[PDB]
Each structure stands twice: as structure tokens, then as C-alpha cells.
């Protein structure tokens, strides 16, 4: 593997430095599987990367499936990853933030964790906001800021980003600093059908009149 | 009158002095009298406020 | 306009071939204040194309605002016609021998000599005639590339688009799958870049962006055609101006084939990212910063104004999308304009375009307008009924007059 090894390690290094979305993600899963099959003694620091990738995909949601990892995880030296997974699956922001700021010399010092903690913290906030927004019809923005533990401007930016992404169905009232969600549905199909009928009648009448000459 | 009616397709509340600058009517009083005549004839749906000198377009 | 960042050495090294002289003369005659570098480059490399009449005219005008070497021009003309006659003799003996490879080589060298000398139409007609004598797939692809390049030089893109389409469709439906996303040689990428340049010159920005976005960096550089930086710029600007949010995210933001292409243009990458994440003030500021350098391009100078207007209108429409009642002071601050200018722009947009809103110039607030379907349908149906009744009465009268035979005679 003289050429293949060099090419694959180069791809890995710029994908670690940059992280080009799904291609870098697949490279990361394949590399992590390779280092799990071959690099057995490196699991002590590989488990953090494994759980991070688990919360990035948020599809497997089975990091505790391996029963062999539990006895080594219950050791209190390394449990921040496990409690982060439990908080992330539970979808609660306060526990996540408290654990992140309380835990020291384990998380905030690693650039490969720091560069991806932003999306990790944003996903739970987005999900909690989406769950919160369901029952209300017109809800204040300061209330959302109180619930999500972020400033008003951050809440407005998050709401704008979610509305543009068609994940939240509603519109922001800036003057009164609230947002109103559309819950009422009217029968617009009847009026659309009437409009189509009117247009067809107009065209048909014009043609019938123009026939005579 | 056509220009004044077109002013209702974009605006909700327009100052009289400001409005008599897009229709080239040269005067807030002239614009006010034009709006009053148009309301009386039923061509437009609007109200006049003399305290603020502003015409509000309803179109409902 | 003092620009130190525009490095003429790298700008010249990016291209090669004939396009270099037209690009240099365009930047020279649209951009002053390049005296020392322009003089050095001209003195070192102006000797090509054996055409210095307009060149001397322009430099004489420049000198009078702020020559002909008979021996040198005679020597260049003599060796040019000597090699032309030699190539004629080689073509004659090759056609006498009647060998397909010999005649193909003959047309290849004739096309090369015509490109060097500056004659294009005769080469194009010769290649079109020689098309029927080319039978191999590689030979027909080579002649397609040659006709494409001469047509690009001659600036007739509508004629060349059919050639690109035929070259794409002839070989087993674009190589069926595409040969594992192109093979070692970069021919599909060249076809895509030529088609994108033609579409851009024909004022179809969406098609130009869609063609240029498929270019792969495996092509490395194409000195005859546009540079990698240029294709990145064109495919970024057209995509920003035409693609909507979903298409932009799917094809530019997330695609793992154009990011490394945008790595050559950090300014364009930042522009598109800030447009995506709603940093309109910064995006517009850097767009205005880059406009001055963009105006000196060759194939993008005419379209700069239209592209910028489309981008700004798209930003204005996307800003008001999530809001039902927006404050015009914040909007004016975010779009680098005064409240009056923003009001005028908003009026122009509301009258025709996609914004459905009403301005309130007392409190300076833009309110979204929701139209009820019931009243609108009732109004339109009643209007249609009135028109129908009027037309029916009119045609009844027309039938009466036609039956009675009423018409205007000459006396």
C-alpha cells in the first residue's frame, strides 16, 4: 500500500483539518472502524471520538450496546463522554451545560472536540425549541430565551434559521418581540377550484364568441 | 388619480407632504383635496388625519 | 484605483495561448495605473500574433496623452509564409500518398499554424470539411475540442453549443455512467466548462452555474480556457444570484466537489457562506469591495450589474421571509442604506416582485399582507360574469347586423 496508504492518509488529514460534510463523515467512520479493529489498546482515547461520532450521526443511538465497555466506563476517571451521551439523548440543555463547564481538563482542551461542540450544543437547543413551540399559538421570545438559556438575539437568529429551513411553521413579530405559529387551516381548495373554473369559463366564452364571424 | 390609486398597492400610511412628491401634486393641501375628492367619489378607501397630516389606506 | 493585490505574474501564468493577449489588452484599456508591470510584460512578451498596428496606435495615443520595425516585421512575415508554404507542400504530398493518419496530422498542423498566425474562419471551415474524414472516437473528440476552442475565440457561443451537445451525446450517451466520474483525462470537464462559458455569455446564469458546478479539480488547469479561479468565481456568483436556498445548500454548500474549488477564492467562499447564514451587511460590503476587481474581467464585466442586482434582490426577499412585522431601521442598517432608499427599493419590489407587504411610513414598519381567498375569488368571478354578459350582448348585435347584411360600400 505505498500509493494507497499515502493517498488515504492525506485524505484523512485534510478531512480532519477541514471536515467536508458527508465525505469527511464517511472517512471518519471508516477510519474509526479501522482503528477499532486494529488499534485495540487505543480505545482509552478512541471511545471519546466514538461517542462524539455517535452524537453527530444521532441515528445509531446505541453506544452502550457493547457490554464489555461498561466495566471500564464505570471507572470515575472517564465518564464525561457517557454522561454527555445520556444528556444528549435525553435532550436537556441544563445538564449538558453544567457537565460541560464543571468537567475540566477532559473536553475543552481538545481541538478535535472543540471544533464540533458547537453543532452538538445547537442540535439539542433546536430540538428543545421545536418541542416547546408545539402547543402555543403566539409565544413571547423572552420566554424562549429563558427556557433555552440564551440571549434574545440568539433566540431570534435561531428562530430565523429554523423558519427559513422549514422546520418551524410560524412568523416572527419584531415590534412586539413574539412569534405566531400558524395553527388554523381553512378550506382553500374550494376557492382554488372556483378560480380554475372561472378562468376556464372566461377562456371558453372568449373562444365561443370569437367563433362567429 | 391613477397614480394615487397605485399608491394604495404598496403603502399603508403615507404623509401628505411625502405623498405629494411621488404624484407631483406640488402641495400637501393639493394632495389632501385630491384624496378628499377621491374618497367622496368612492374611488378610493382611505382616511385623512390632519393632526399628523397623514393619509391611511384601508382597501378593505 | 490603487490595487497591489492583483499580481500580473500569477495572472499571466494562469493562462496560456492566444487568450492571453486579449485578456491583457482588456485589463490594460480598462484599468490605468499599471505602468511599470504593463511595460515589463509588454516588452518581454508582446512579440506574438504578428499584429502590432492597433497596438502601436494605442501606445501612440497613450504617449500623446501622457515604432514600426520594418526589418523585424519583414522577417516575421517571411518565416511565417515560408512555413505556411512548407505546410502546404507537406499537405500536398500527404494527400498524394492518401493516408488517413497523414492527412489528419496535416489538418492538425494547419490548425495549429492558423491559431498561431491569427486566421480562424478558414481553419474552422477546413475542420468542418475534414469532419467527415475523421472516423475514430478520439479523432472526432479532438476535432470537436478544436472547433469548440476556435468558436470560443470567435465569440459565437450559440453555434458552439450544438457542437458541445453533439460531442456529449455521440460517445455512447456521454460514456453512459461517465467512466467512474471521469477517467484520467479531463475531457468531460472541458466540455462542461465550455458549455458553462457559452451559457454565461448567452445570459443564462442558472445554466452557466449548473454547468460550471460539475467541473472537477482533477482537471487541474486549462490554460487555453478560463482559469480555475475564474470558473470558481463564475459558478459562485451565478449560483448565488439564481439558486434558491434549497438548491444552494444541496449543490454548493454541502457538495464535496466545489468546496476545494472555492478554496482558491476565500472572498467568494465567505460571500456565499455569509449569504447563507444571513449576514447580509457583511456579504454586501465584501461584494461591493470585490466589484471593482470583478469589473476588469473579460466574460463577466457585462453581467456584473445584473448579477449584483439579482443578488441584492434575493437578499432583500430572503430577509423579510420569516417576519410578519419588520422594523425598517434595522433593515436599513443591515442593508447599508438609508431608510428612504430602503423605502424606495421596497416599493419597487412590492409593486412587481416576490415581496407581498405594505409599508408604514409613520412608524417605519413593513407589515406582511395576507390576502383572503374568498373575497378575491368572489371579485374575480363577478368581474368575469360582467365581461361575459357584455360580450354576449355585443355578439348578439353582431349576429343581427351580419344577418341583415350591413356593410360600408365604396360610394
SS3 per residue for chain C: CCCCCCCHHHHHHHCCCCHHHHHHHHHHHHCCCCHHHHHHHHHHHCCHHHCCHHHHHHHHHHHHHCCCCHHHHHHHHHHHHHHHHHHHHHHHHHHHHCCHHHHHHHHHHHHHHHHHHCCCHHHHHHHHHHHHHCCCHHHHHHHHHHHHHHHHHHCCHHHHHHHHHHHHHCCHHHHCCCCCCCCCCCCHHHHHHHHHHHHHHCCCHHHHHHHHCCCCHHHCCCCCCCCHHHHHHHHHHHHHHHCCHHHHHHHHHCCCCCHHHHCCCHHHHHHHHHHHCCCHHHHHHHHHHHHHHHCCCCCCCCCHHHHHHHHHHHHHHHHCCCEEEEEHHHHHHHCCCCHHHHHHHHHHHHHHCCCCEEEECCCCEEEECCCCHHHHHHHHHHHHHHHHHHHHHHHHHHHHHHHHCCCCCCC
Are C388 and A176 inside 8 Å of each other by CB?
Answer: no
- In whole angstroms, give the CA distance from residue C93 to residue C223: 34
Chain A environment of C324 (Cβ under 8 Å): 171-173, 180
Beta strand extents in A70-147 (DSSP E only): 138-140
- In whole angstroms, give the CA distance from residue C101 to residue C115: 21
Q: How far is CA A145 from the centre of its chain?
A: 19
The partner residue sitting opposite A180, judged by closest CB among C245, C277, C324, is: C324
b vs e for C224-262, b when ≥16 Cβ sit within 10 Å of the residue's Cβ?
Answer: bbbbbbbbbbbbbbbbbbbbebeebeebbbebebbbebb
Chain B environment of C362 (Cβ under 8 Å): 13, 15, 52, 54
Residue C276 backbone dihedrals phi, psi, to 5 degrees: -65, -45
- In whole angstroms, give the CA distance from residue C336 to residue C289: 13
Chain C meets chain B (3+ C-beta pairs below 8 A): yes
For residue B43, how many other CB atoms are within 10 A of its CB? 13
Are A175 and C399 inside 8 Å of each other by CB?
Answer: no
DSSP category for residue B55: E
C-alpha cell at A195: 378560480
> Residues with Cβ < 8 Å from A182, sequence gap 6 or more?
A169, A170, A171
DSSP category for residue A207: H
Task: Determine which helix (DSSP H) or strand (DSSP E) holds A197, and give its type and residue range.
Answer: helix A188-211
C-alpha cell at C135: 472516423
> Residues with Cβ < 8 Å from C44, sequence gap 6 or more?
none
Which has the closest alpha carbon to C360: A153, A172, B11, A96? B11
Task: Determine which helix (DSSP H) or strand (DSSP E) holds A23, and give its type and residue range.
Answer: helix A21-37
- In whole angstroms, give the CA distance from residue C318 to residue C305: 20
Resolution of the experimental model in angstroms, please?
3.3
DSSP category for residue B57: E
The partner residue sitting opposite C358, judged by closest CB among B12, B15, B52, is: B12
Distance from CA of B15 to the nearest CA of C (A): 7
Which of A137, A138, A198, A200 is most worth mutating to test chain C (most C CB atoms within 10 A of its CB)?
A198
- In whole angstroms, give the CA distance from residue C357 to residue C369: 5
Are A22 and C256 inside 8 Å of each other by CB?
Answer: yes
Distance from CA of C348 to the nearest CA of B (A): 9
Are C259 and A20 inside 8 Å of each other by CB?
Answer: yes
C378 touches chain B (CB under 8 A): no
Are C380 and A195 inside 8 Å of each other by CB?
Answer: yes
Which has the closest alpha carbon to C313: C270, C282, C342? C342
Distance from CA of C327 to the nearest CA of A (A): 7
- In whole angstroms, give the CA distance from residue A12 to residue A2: 16
Q: Is A62 helix (H, G, I), strand (E, B) or coil?
A: coil
How was this structure determined? It was done by: cryo-EM
Residue C336 backbone dihedrals phi, psi, to 5 degrees: 55, 40
For residue C65, how many other CB atoms are within 10 A of its CB? 6
Residue B40 lies in a domain: yes
Q: Which residue in chain A is spatially nearest to C323 when comparing CA positions?
A: A172
Chain B environment of C347 (Cβ under 8 Å): 10-11
Which has the closest alpha carbon to C174: C189, C159, C160? C189
DSSP category for residue B60: -
Which has the closest alpha carbon to C362: A2, A90, B58, B49? B49
Distance from CA of A89 to the nearest CA of C (A): 26
Chain A environment of C370 (Cβ under 8 Å): none
- In whole angstroms, give the CA distance from residue C202 to residue B51: 56
Please report how many Cα atoms fall inside a 13 Å half-sphere around the Cα of residue C183, on the Cβ side: 7
DSSP category for residue B20: T
C-alpha cell at C127: 475542420
Chain C window 203-232: which residues touch B at a Cβ cutoff of 8 Å? none
Beta-bridge mates of residue B49: B54
Q: In terms of C-beta density within 10 A (0-12 exposed, 13-18 middle, 19 or more buried), how is residue A171 classed?
A: buried
Do the beta carbons of residue C250 and residue C231 sit within 8 Å? no
Which has the closest alpha carbon to C238: C338, C310, C325, C169? C310
Which has the closest alpha carbon to C12: C48, C53, C45, C39? C45
Do the beta carbons of residue C50 and residue C113 sit within 8 Å? no
Chain B environment of C361 (Cβ under 8 Å): 11, 13-15, 18
C-alpha cell at C153: 475565440
- What total of structural domains would you count in chain B? 1
- In whole angstroms, give the CA distance from residue C50 to residue C46: 9
Which has the closest alpha carbon to C309: C366, C242, C403? C242
Beta-bridge mates of residue C323: A172
Which has the closest alpha carbon to A64: A80, A46, A51? A51
How does strand B11-15 pair with strand C357-360?
A: parallel
Residue B32 lies in a domain: yes
The partner residue sitting opposite C351, judged by closest CB among B10, B52, B54, is: B10
Residue B29 lies in a domain: yes
C79 touches chain B (CB under 8 A): no
Residue B2 lies in a domain: no
Q: Which residue in chain C is spatially nearest to B22 when comparing CA positions?
A: C344
Looking up cell 454522561 gives: A83
- In whole angstroms, give the CA distance from residue C248 to residue A51: 31
Residue B34 lies in a domain: yes
Residue B1 lies in a domain: no
Beta-bridge mates of residue B15: B54
What is the separation, in whole angstroms, between the first and last Cα of chain B?
Answer: 19
Strand order in the sheet with A170-173: A138-140, A178-181, A170-173, C323-327, C365-368, C357-360, B11-15, B54-57, B46-49
C-alpha cell at A176: 412586539
For residue A134, how many other CB atoms are within 10 A of its CB? 8
For residue B37, the enclosing domain spans 7-60
- In whole angstroms, give the CA distance from residue C166 to residue C191: 11
How does strand A170-173 pair with strand C323-327?
A: parallel
Kindly calculate the radius of gyration of chain A based on its CA atoms and give it in whole angstroms: 26
Q: Is A53 helix (H, G, I), strand (E, B) or coil?
A: helix
C-alpha cell at C109: 498542423
Chain A environment of C323 (Cβ under 8 Å): 171-174
Amino acid at each position: 500500500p505505498l500509493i494507497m496508504g499515502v493517498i488515504r492518509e492525506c485524505g484523512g488529514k485534510m478531512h480532519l483539518r477541514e471536515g467536508e460534510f458527508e465525505k469527511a463523515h464517511t472517512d471518519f467512520f471508516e477510519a474509526f472502524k479501522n482503528y477499532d479493529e486494529s488499534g485495540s489498546p487505543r480505545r482509552t482515547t478512541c471511545l471519546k471520538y466514538l461517542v462524539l461520532a455517535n452524537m453527530l450521526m444521532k441515528s445509531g443511538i446505541n453506544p452502550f450496546d457493547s457490554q464489555e465497555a461498561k466495566p471500564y466506563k464505570n471507572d470515575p476517571e472517564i465518564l464525561a463522554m457517557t454522561n454527555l451521551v445520556s444528556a444528549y439523548q435525553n435532550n436537556d440543555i441544563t445538564e449538558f451545560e453544567k457537565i460541560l463547564k464543571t468537567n475540566h481538563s477532559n473536553i475543552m482542551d481538545d481541538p478535535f472536540i472543540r471544533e464540533h461542540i458547537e453543532e452538538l450544543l445547537r442540535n439539542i437547543r433546536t430540538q428543545v425549541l421545536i418541542k416547546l413551540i408545539k402547543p402555543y399559538t403566539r409565544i413571547h421570545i423572552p420566554f424562549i430565551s429563558k427556557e433555552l438559556n440564551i440571549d434574545v438575539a440568539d433566540v431570534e437568529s435561531l428562530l430565523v434559521q429554523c423558519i427559513l429551513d422549514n422546520t418551524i411553521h410560524g412568523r416572527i413579530d419584531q415590534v412586539n418581540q413574539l412569534l405566531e405559529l400558524d395553527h388554523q387551516k381553512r378550506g382553500g381548495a374550494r376557492y382554488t377550484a372556483l378560480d380554475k373554473w372561472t378562468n376556464q369559463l372566461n377562456s371558453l366564452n372568449q373562444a365561443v364568441v370569437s367563433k362567429l364571424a | 388619480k391613477k397614480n394615487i390609486q397605485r399608491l394604495t398597492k404598496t403603502f399603508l400610511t403615507l404623509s401628505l407632504q411625502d405623498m405629494a412628491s411621488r404624484v407631483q401634486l406640488s402641495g400637501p393641501q393639493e394632495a389632501e383635496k385630491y384624496v378628499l375628492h377621491m374618497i367622496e367619489d368612492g374611488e378610493i378607501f382611505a382616511s385623512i388625519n390632519q393632526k399628523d397630516g397623514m393619509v391611511s389606506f384601508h382597501d378593505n | 484605483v490603487e490595487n497591489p493585490s492583483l499580481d500580473l505574474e500569477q495572472y499571466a501564468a494562469s493562462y496560456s495561448g492566444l487568450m492571453r493577449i486579449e485578456r491583457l489588452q482588456f485589463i490594460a484599456d480598462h484599468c490605468p495605473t499599471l505602468r511599470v508591470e504593463a511595460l515589463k510584460m509588454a516588452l518581454s512578451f508582446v512579440q506574438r500574433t504578428f499584429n502590432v498596428d492597433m497596438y502601436e496606435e494605442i501606445h501612440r495615443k497613450l504617449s500623446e496623452a501622457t515604432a514600426l520595425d520594418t526589418a523585424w516585421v519583414e522577417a516575421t512575415r517571411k518565416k511565417a509564409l515560408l512555413k505556411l508554404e512548407k505546410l502546404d507542400t507537406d499537405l500536398k504530398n500527404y494527400k498524394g500518398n492518401s493516408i488517413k493518419e497523414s492527412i489528419r496530422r496535416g489538418h492538425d498542423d494547419l490548425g495549429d499554424h492558423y491559431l498561431d498566425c491569427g486566421d480562424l474562419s478558414n481553419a474552422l471551415k477546413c475542420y468542418s470539411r475534414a469532419r467527415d474524414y475523421c472516423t475514430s472516437a478520439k479523432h472526432v473528440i479532438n476535432m470537436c475540442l478544436n472547433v469548440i476552442k476556435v468558436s470560443v475565440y470567435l465569440q459565437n457561443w450559440s453555434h458552439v453549443l450544438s457542437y458541445v451537445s453533439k460531442a456529449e451525446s455521440t460517445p455512447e450517451i456521454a460514456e453512459q455512467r461517465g467512466e467512474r466520474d471521469s477517467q484520467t483525462q479531463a475531457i468531460l470537464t472541458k466540455l462542461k466548462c465550455a458549455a458553462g462559458l457559452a451559457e454565461l455569455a448567452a445570459r443564462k446564469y442558472k445554466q452557466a452555474a449548473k454547468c460550471l458546478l460539475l467541473a472537477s479539480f482533477d482537471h487541474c488547469d486549462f490554460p487555453e480556457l478560463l482559469s480555475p479561479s475564474n470558473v470558481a468565481i463564475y459558478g459562485g456568483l451565478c449560483a448565488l444570484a439564481t439558486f434558491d436556498r434549497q438548491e444552494l445548500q444541496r449543490n454548493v454548500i454541502s457538495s464535496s466537489s466545489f468546496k476545494l474549488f472555492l478554496e482558491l477564492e476565500p472572498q467568494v467562499r465567505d460571500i456565499i457562506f455569509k449569504f447563507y447564514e444571513s449576514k447580509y451587511a457583511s456579504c454586501l460590503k465584501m461584494l461591493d469591495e470585490m466589484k471593482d476587481n470583478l469589473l476588469l474581467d473579460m466574460y463577466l464585466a457585462p453581467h456584473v450589474r445584473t448579477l449584483y442586482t439579482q443578488i441584492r434582490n434575493r437578499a432583500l426577499i430572503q430577509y423579510f421571509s420569516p417576519y410578519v412585522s419588520a422594523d425598517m431601521h434595522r433593515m436599513a442598517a443591515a442593508f447599508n442604506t438609508t431608510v428612504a432608499a430602503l423605502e424606495d427599493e421596497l416599493t419597487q419590489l412590492i409593486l412587481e416582485g416576490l415581496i407581498s407587504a405594505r409599508v408604514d411610513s409613520h412608524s417605519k414598519i413593513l407589515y406582511a399582507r395576507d390576502v383572503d381567498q374568498r373575497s378575491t375569488t368572489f371579485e374575480k368571478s363577478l368581474l368575469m360574469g360582467k365581461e361575459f354578459q357584455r360580450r354576449a350582448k355585443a355578439m348578439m348585435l353582431r349576429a343581427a347586423v351580419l344577418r341583415n347584411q350591413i356593410h360600408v360600400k365604396s360610394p
